[PDB]
Amino acid sequence: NITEEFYQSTCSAVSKGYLSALRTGWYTSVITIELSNIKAKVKLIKQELDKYKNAVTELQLLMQFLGFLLGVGSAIASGVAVCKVLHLEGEVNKIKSALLSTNKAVVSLSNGVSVLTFKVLDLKNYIDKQLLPISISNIETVIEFQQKNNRLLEITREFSVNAGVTTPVSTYMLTNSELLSLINDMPITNDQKKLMSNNVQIVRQQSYSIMCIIKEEVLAYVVQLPLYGVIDTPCWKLHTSPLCTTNTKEGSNICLTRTDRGWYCDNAGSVSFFPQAETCKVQSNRVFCDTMNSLTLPSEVNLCNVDIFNPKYDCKIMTSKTDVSSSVITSLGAIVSCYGKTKCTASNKNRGIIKTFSNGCDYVSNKGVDTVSVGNTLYYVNKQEGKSLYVKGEPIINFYDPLVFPSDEFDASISQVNEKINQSLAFI
Amino acid sequence: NITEEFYQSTCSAVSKGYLSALRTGWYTSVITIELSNIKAKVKLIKQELDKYKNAVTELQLLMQFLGFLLGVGSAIASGVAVCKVLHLEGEVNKIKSALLSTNKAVVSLSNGVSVLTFKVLDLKNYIDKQLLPISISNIETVIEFQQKNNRLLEITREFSVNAGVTTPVSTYMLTNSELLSLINDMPITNDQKKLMSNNVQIVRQQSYSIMCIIKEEVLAYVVQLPLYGVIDTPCWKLHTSPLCTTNTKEGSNICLTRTDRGWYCDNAGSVSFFPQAETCKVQSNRVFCDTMNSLTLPSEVNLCNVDIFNPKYDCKIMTSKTDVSSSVITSLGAIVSCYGKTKCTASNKNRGIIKTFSNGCDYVSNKGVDTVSVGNTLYYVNKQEGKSLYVKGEPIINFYDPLVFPSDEFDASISQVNEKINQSLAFI
Amino acid sequence: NITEEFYQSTCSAVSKGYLSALRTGWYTSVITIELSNIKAKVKLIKQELDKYKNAVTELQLLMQFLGFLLGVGSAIASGVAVCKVLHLEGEVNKIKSALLSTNKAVVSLSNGVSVLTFKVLDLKNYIDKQLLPISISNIETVIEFQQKNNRLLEITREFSVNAGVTTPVSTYMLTNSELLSLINDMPITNDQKKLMSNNVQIVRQQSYSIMCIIKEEVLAYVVQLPLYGVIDTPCWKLHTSPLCTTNTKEGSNICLTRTDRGWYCDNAGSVSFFPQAETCKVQSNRVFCDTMNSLTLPSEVNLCNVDIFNPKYDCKIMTSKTDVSSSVITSLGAIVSCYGKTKCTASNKNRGIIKTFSNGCDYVSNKGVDTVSVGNTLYYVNKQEGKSLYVKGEPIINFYDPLVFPSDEFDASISQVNEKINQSLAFI
Ligand SMILES: CS(=O)(=O)CCCn1c(Cn2c(=O)n(CC(F)(F)F)c3ccncc32)cc2cc(Cl)ccc21
Ligand SMILES: *[C@@H]1O[C@H](CO)[C@@H](O)[C@H](O)[C@H]1NC(C)=O
Ligand SMILES: *[C@@H]1O[C@H](CO)[C@@H](O)[C@H](O)[C@H]1NC(C)=O
Ligand SMILES: *[C@@H]1O[C@H](CO)[C@@H](O)[C@H](O)[C@H]1NC(C)=O
């Protein structure tokens, strides 16, 4: 149930009804491919083997508005931390020996980590059985080999053009089969296992493959998978657009814009705020975000939608004198900031222009509306089903005296502006 | 005929002679691949069929300075709007039944859209004819199948690692043949058809492939192609760089920079302004932009190049006290902002340093010049043929008193600065 | 020997011990593939030849905080400059005729350039010998052809989906073999040759492939490779985070942040400063940067780490009143800016929370620490071995009176703030 409210007084809109899936952590696992140390259908194998030899060579060669408020993480530090351990002597042999008679196992490593290790491809035992004695005979060994070899080559290609770190994680790095099994064996809730299983492509996109080592006939890379420690909490998206006075004299106008646009998700008694809404992806009513790109705010930040002048949170805005027209396409409609001589319209498919916007900040829902045009820019609106509510209010920019209005404030708020205006009235 | 003028008084340059190709809209079409529901050269087919089976599985699994002034669109809303319709019951059967005896057809869909539908691959009729009865015989059916199957796999790979939305649109999604035919059948001018046909790679880059549905032996994805509703209008690129006073005392200097740099194209009586010049691509003298990343301004914005103090448009600038050196490589030359103790030079290939810049903002054309060096940074200049004109003028930063100069203004203009300076002179 | 110092007085840290590898220039070379003009195992060749024909068709069709202070280069201007020369009549024939009996040669071109030219694939002599007379016989010609043809197709695919410019440079554009030979024949020091040879993937990432021409049975593209004119100079990374007062009253607090974060490398008597630390890549203790994304500063910029109030350089800061919590993961630890009611902790793997941060800016090294948590955000810390030093000092934000503190300054410095504060004290 996606709904939306437009706030006329502050030229912003809030889309709600979303459920969260936030990456809160990482799950690291070691993926191994055992390699072989070597020297008509045979000539096919000859070629297939030469390519094997230089893929191995390649792998060996491989190892010789409010965004500015965010902190800075190190995205593959967990995975790299695991990799640095595989570089201890005999450490890959602990993995090697544990995966002797089994393809997947939980190996207790040295530094005090217990990682699910997984041998996805046993080229070693292939070459050292159905290859070594040669003897043409059957074509089925030729194609089974080309198949296993191809995975190797695709892994090698990805690592080389990406300097050993890839994202999203391909099906060559980790098949649907293996990923599903990995998902099934993680120390997580069932609600989490099913979430991941029904969204593997989103999972792959939030994952890393990290080339670790190729030592003692063994290729090891670490796959770093998202932990969704916050699921099914309410999320909402806040859209904002410039609110300006609409005097006919050019340059006599003042504007303010709510700078706190982005994604918001309830999270452990606070709210996770994602200023760069590209760090989140929406699947139906589920929104996948990453906590690394967020701020943790008091829940009172939401009072800025209902009352931007509330005493519990100092709502954030920027100020300018630059009244350009534009539109923001929301979840269930469109905000239009229309100023000057700009032609601003909304249209239906078969009927054309159905609404002409006058100067100021207005809004239209997506019911019956397919496109929106501001100046020379045509925006298609999203055709998501959901109810829209227009909340009438006096545009707050009307409450300010342009003679003492502080323009060109960026990292500002309702209070900071009040203090300045008052500071300006002190000069009398 | 590419020309260029440098304005000494404002440390900016304008490259003109370009012709426009602006994406103003979208053309949506439905691409279908009919699928089959199933169970030495045959063993080849066996493998080729197993890969078919899990590609289908993968697809099913798949479905379970002035940039801050821009508005915010929803780039694939038109395509997704078409997709939501294919999810109506029997709606893909309207497409299916219409493409019974033909590969391309204009199917009138339910929601009041008429989309060109296109069956690019008929795997269904391949498996259910030259495959089902099996019977080795000829190798030509093996390779014709691997070929058709490969397209499927490549489409599947792109959709999975991109969560069902790809751009640019590959030749696997849509061949040169099919694209050309699609281009040929669109309700557009010939000037537009030829523009697209002579720039398919640019077209592909401005296009989207959107995975829609895999229902009733049919795979459907929507290809979203650019409409160039503005062609062959004059475009010009504005380059800007910091203009500072050059006093020898550190920290006693003031700077201003024109913030209105970017691409400009004449468009329907106004001017389309593209602040993020990476949203535009130049092919020879043709410049491909996207109106979604633009502002619509009065044509008077161009008066800022000839006269930044003009009364018809309030030209935009920022102010600082930070006189670092740098260079901007233009279309036909280079702007050099040289301050402090920085070594700034221009050079020819075989002759080395030919010009040493003194402190301030200067310019050199690309005739005889191959490189430009500011400090430890070497820039190669573009070697495009075209005439360059140096327009002499007193640097306007000399007209300002540093004692009342407002520095650290970002979203500013000539007037805003005047009002502030005057506001500062009021304290006397 | 990577070390790190945290400065408590300014909430910043400096990681040192790094060695430089800066791209200072470009090395351009011409890569050619000679093409053929044409018309069971033969049917294999038939298919392989049809794909050849349309790859050629595709290629022919193909040719018809302080970042805002950076200048603007033109990244492939050197390579494109070389390309414009190959478009002179008979100019590719100079290359063609010179590569008659040899695969690599230094061809003196017209415009006064001498470029190493390299024929990596001779399809012409393949088709016009082991193909033309046909005659099935041996399978080894089939697979040797598919192999050579495949490279062609992969090159063609990359150029088409990238509009003729690719980066990083694939092994299909240029094999490890060819790249190593190219590296070996460049007019560079041995220290440089070995640097490149031990980091080909980094090299490929800093390279461009530029499709030039397909004329007279010859395909030519220009490969643009990095020149590392600065090697083995000391580099250091500066991390910064917001420093705020910690009064319990909301909105009564003031903050400052050092804006000069990024990479620093000693370079020719000055310092190269890279504000966008993503323009640099770290391999062990080697850091690869690009001078195009840098400023050239006096070496005195480093005094801001030991003494931000020094008289030799005006250290840069921004100011605000926005005391949000966050963390910056450094090379050997973590900076924590903890304000308001935010829960801030550091943890060990097997032991959990080991340190709770109080309000203000603090730091913890990576020894014994694996994760850091600020609010709802968990950051893994880097597990690099190296010594960390905590430098105690009074947080400088305590030296300022909030009543005359200038907040919302972005492009500011210690002096600019002093002048403003003093300017504010003038109103008495
Ligand atoms: C990603 S980021 O760059 O860190 C955001 C910075 C945005 N920002 C601005 C507005 N502003 C820019 O956006 N840029 C950068 C650009 F030019 F790219 F827009 C500025 C260059 C100088 N002065 C003000 C600039 C004023 C301001 C004031 C405070 Cl206290 C904090 C942040 C602020
Ligand atoms: C602003 O006005 C309020 C009146 O409500 C007053 O209390 C305050 O002192 C004034 N000045 C500032 C800087 O807030
Ligand atoms: C600035 O100077 C002009 C004089 O041309 C005057 O008209 C104006 O009132 C002054 N002040 C402002 C804020 O523009
Ligand atoms: C600031 O204070 C210093 C005192 O050290 C004084 O010299 C200076 O004139 C004052 N004002 C400015 C704008 O620097």
Residue numbers in the entry:
A (entry chain F), B (entry chain F), C (entry chain F): 27 to 65, 74 to 98, 137 to 206, 213 to 506
What does the paper say about this structure?
Respiratory syncytial virus (RSV) is an important respiratory pathogen that causes substantial morbidity and mortality in patients of different age groups. In order to initiate its replication cycle, the envelope of RSV must fuse with a host-cell membrane. After a triggering event, prefusion F protein undergoes a profound conformational change that facilitates fusion of the viral and cellular membranes and results in an extremely stable post-fusion F protein conformation.
JNJ-53718678 is a recently discovered small-molecule RSV fusion inhibitor currently under clinical evaluation in infants hospitalized for RSV infection. To further characterize the exact binding mode of JNJ-53718678, the X-ray crystal structure of the inhibitor bound to prefusion RSV F was determined at 2.5 Å resolution. Electron density for JNJ-53718678 was observed in the central cavity along the threefold trimeric axis. JNJ-53718678 asymmetrically occupies two of the three identical lobes of the binding pocket and forms aromatic-stacking interactions with RSV F residues Phe488 and Phe140. Similarly, in lobe 2, between RSV F protomers A and C (FA and FC, respectively), the imidazo-pyridinone scaffold forms π–π stacking with Phe488A and Phe488C, and a weak C-H/π interaction with Phe140A. Rearrangement of the side chains of Phe140, Phe488, and Phe137 also results in the formation of a hydrophobic clamp that traps the trifluoro group of the inhibitor in the more solvent-exposed, membrane-distal region of the binding site. Finally, a sulfone oxygen, positioned at the more solvent-exposed, membrane-distal part of the binding site, is involved in a water-mediated hydrogen bond with the side chain of Arg339 through two structured water molecules.
